[PDB]
Design a protein around this ligand. Structure first.
Ligand SMILES: Cc1cc2nc3c(=O)[nH]c(=O)nc-3n(C[C@H](O)[C@H](O)[C@H](O)COP(=O)(O)OP(=O)(O)OC[C@H]3O[C@@H](n4cnc5c(N)ncnc54)[C@H](O)[C@@H]3O)c2cc1C
Length: 383
C-alpha cells in the first residue's frame, strides 16, 4: 500500500526531501556515496562552507515539513537585521532589511536532519554510489557500487545528488533534457575571524564586529564577506576571479599587501599571516552553474531537486534556500494532486522553471549591483 522512493544524495536538500517524503508516508531510502558525516572516521565532511544564510523561505520550507523539528534544528541560528557595508576607509554603514536571513552552521544543520531521519523509517545508506538506473513503466531499478554491485527497485527516484548529478545523467537517456553547464570565472576562499577574548555586551557575545549583520566589503569584481558563528567567531569568505587569485598567490607579500590595501579594517580582527596562508593553501573548488529542463521523467518516475536541478553562483544566488523551496513546492503539488506524481512532477517542471528564470535574473542583478557596478572612490582603490 505504500510507495517506495530512492533519494540520491544526503546533502542538505536530499535530507530535507527525505524528511518531507518520509513524513508524508512514503518508504524512503536515502543513498550517498560519502561516509556518514556524523562519524569521526569520516575525514571528508564535504562542507563547501562552514556556515550558511538561511532565508525566511528556507526556514518556512523546513517548518512546513516538521515544525517541532524545525524549532529544535534551528535553535542556534543567528538572525540578521541587515547588511553592514565596509568601504575602503574601513567605514561601516548599516543597511537594514530585502529578505531576512539568519546564520546557521552547515555541519550542524546537515547532521541534525540526519538525526531527524533516524527517528523515521527512512533507511540511510551511506557508502552507496548510484551508477545506473533502468527505467520501466512500473519500478525503476537503481544500480549502486558499494564500499561491490547492488541493485534495488523503487517506485520513483529523487535526484538530490548535487551539481554533477548522476541521476540527472541517467534521466537524460529516458527523456530529452535541455542542459547547460558553465564554469564560472570565480573562486572563493574561506577565512576566519576569531572570537574576542572578552564578552562584548553590546554584541551579546565574544564578537569582534556586529553579529546581527551580514558584513560585506564590496570591491570591483571581488568581495569579502563575514557571517557570525555561535561561538563569537565569524566565517569569512573572499570571492574573486580565478585570474585575480592566481596572480596574487605567487607571493605571500603580494597577498598580504592586497588584503591590507583593500580591507584595512580586517587587521583589527583577523590574523594576516594565517589569512595569507589560508589564501594560498585553501583548496580552490571549481564553481559550475547548471540548468535543466525538464526536471522530471514523465509518469512521475523521477525528479531533480537542489543543485542537481539548478546549481547556481554562491552568495549572489542562494542554492540551499532554493533547494529547500524546491521541496516545499513539490510537496504542495503532490497534495494538490492527491499523490498523483505523474501530474505533480509535470506541473513542477512547468512552474519551477518559470521560477528559475526569475531567480537567475535576480542573482545576475545582485552580481551587477554588488560587484560589477563598483567604481566609486570609496570602493575602488586609486593608486
Ligand atoms: C561557499 C558557498 C557558500 C554558500 N552559501 C550559501 C548560503 O549562504 N545560502 C544558501 O542558500 N546556499 C548557499 N550555498 C549553496 C549551497 O551550498 C548548495 O546549494 C547546497 O548545499 C546544495 O545542496 P544539495 O543537497 O543540492 O547538493 P550537495 O550538497 O552537492 O549534495 C549532493 C550529495 O549527493 C552525493 N552524491 C553525488 N553523486 C552521487 C552518486 N552518484 N551516488 C550517491 N550519492 C551521490 C554527494 O556525496 C553529496 O553529498 C553556498 C555554496 C557555496 C559553495
Amino acid at each position: 500500500m505504500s510507495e517506495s522512493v530512492a533519494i540520491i544524495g544526503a546533502g542538505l536538500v536530499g535530507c530535507l526531501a527525505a524528511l518531507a517524503f518520509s513524513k508524508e508516508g512514503y518508504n524512503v531510502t536515502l543513498y550517498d556515496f560519502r561516509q556518514d558525516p556524523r562519524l569521526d572516521t569520516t575525514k571528508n565532511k564535504n562542507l563547501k562552507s562552514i556556515n550558511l544564510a538561511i532565508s525566511a523561505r528556507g526556514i518556512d520550507a523546513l517548518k512546513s515539513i516538521d515544525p517541532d523539528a524545525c524549532e529544535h534544528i534551528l535553535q542556534d541560528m543567528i538572525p540578521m537585521k541587515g547588511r553592514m557595508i565596509h568601504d575602503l576607509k574601513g567605514r561601516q554603514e548599516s543597511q537594514l532589511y530585502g529578505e531576512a536571513i539568519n546564520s546557521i552552521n552547515r555541519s550542524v544543520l546537515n547532521n541534525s536532519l540526519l538525526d531527524e531521519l533516524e527517528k523515521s523509517t527512512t533507511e540511510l545508506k551511506f557508502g552507496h554510489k548510484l551508477v545506473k538506473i533502468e527505467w520501466t513503466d512500473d519500478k525503476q531499478i537503481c544500480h549502486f557500487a558499494i564500499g561491490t554491485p547492488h541493485t534495488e527497485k523503487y517506485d520513483f527516484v529523487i535526484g538530490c545528488d548535487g551539481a554533477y548529478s548522476a541521476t540527472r545523467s541517467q534521466m537524460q537517456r529516458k527523456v530529452e533534457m535541455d542542459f547547460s553547464q558553465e564554469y564560472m570565472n570565480l573562486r572563493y576562499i574561506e577565512l576566519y575571524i576569531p572570537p574576542t577574548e572578552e564578552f562584548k555586551p553590546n554584541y551579546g557575545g565574544n564578537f569582534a564586529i556586529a553579529p546581527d549583520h551580514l558584513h560585506i566589503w564590496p570591491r570591483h569584481k571581488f568581495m569579502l564577506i563575514a557571517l557570525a558563528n555561535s561561538d563569537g567567531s565569524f566565517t569569512s569568505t573572499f570571492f574573486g576571479s580565478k585570474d585575480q587569485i592566481s596572480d596574487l598567490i605567487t607571493s605571500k607579500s603580494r597577498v598580504r599587501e592586497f588584503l591590507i590595501e583593500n580591507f584595512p579594517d580586517i587587521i583589527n580582527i583577523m590574523d594576516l599571516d594565517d589569512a595569507v596562508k589560508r589564501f594560498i593553501t585553501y583548496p580552490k573548488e571549481s564553481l559550475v552553474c547548471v540548468n535543466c529542463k525538464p526536471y522530471d521523467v514523465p509518469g512521475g518516475k523521477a525528479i531533480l531537486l537542489g543543485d542537481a536541478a539548478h546549481a547556481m553562483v554562491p552568495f549572489y544566488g542562494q542554492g540551499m534556500n532554493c533547494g529547500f523551496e524546491d521541496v516545499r513546492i513539490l510537496m504542495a503539488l503532490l497534495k494538490k494532486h492527491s499523490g498523483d506524481r505523474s501530474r505533480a512532477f509535470t506541473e513542477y517542471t512547468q512552474t519551477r522553471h518559470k521560477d528559475l528564470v526569475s531567480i537567475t535574473e535576480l542573482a545576475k542583478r545582485n552580481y551587477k549591483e554588488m560587484s560589477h557596478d563598483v567604481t566609486s572612490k570609496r570602493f575602488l582603490l586609486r593608486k
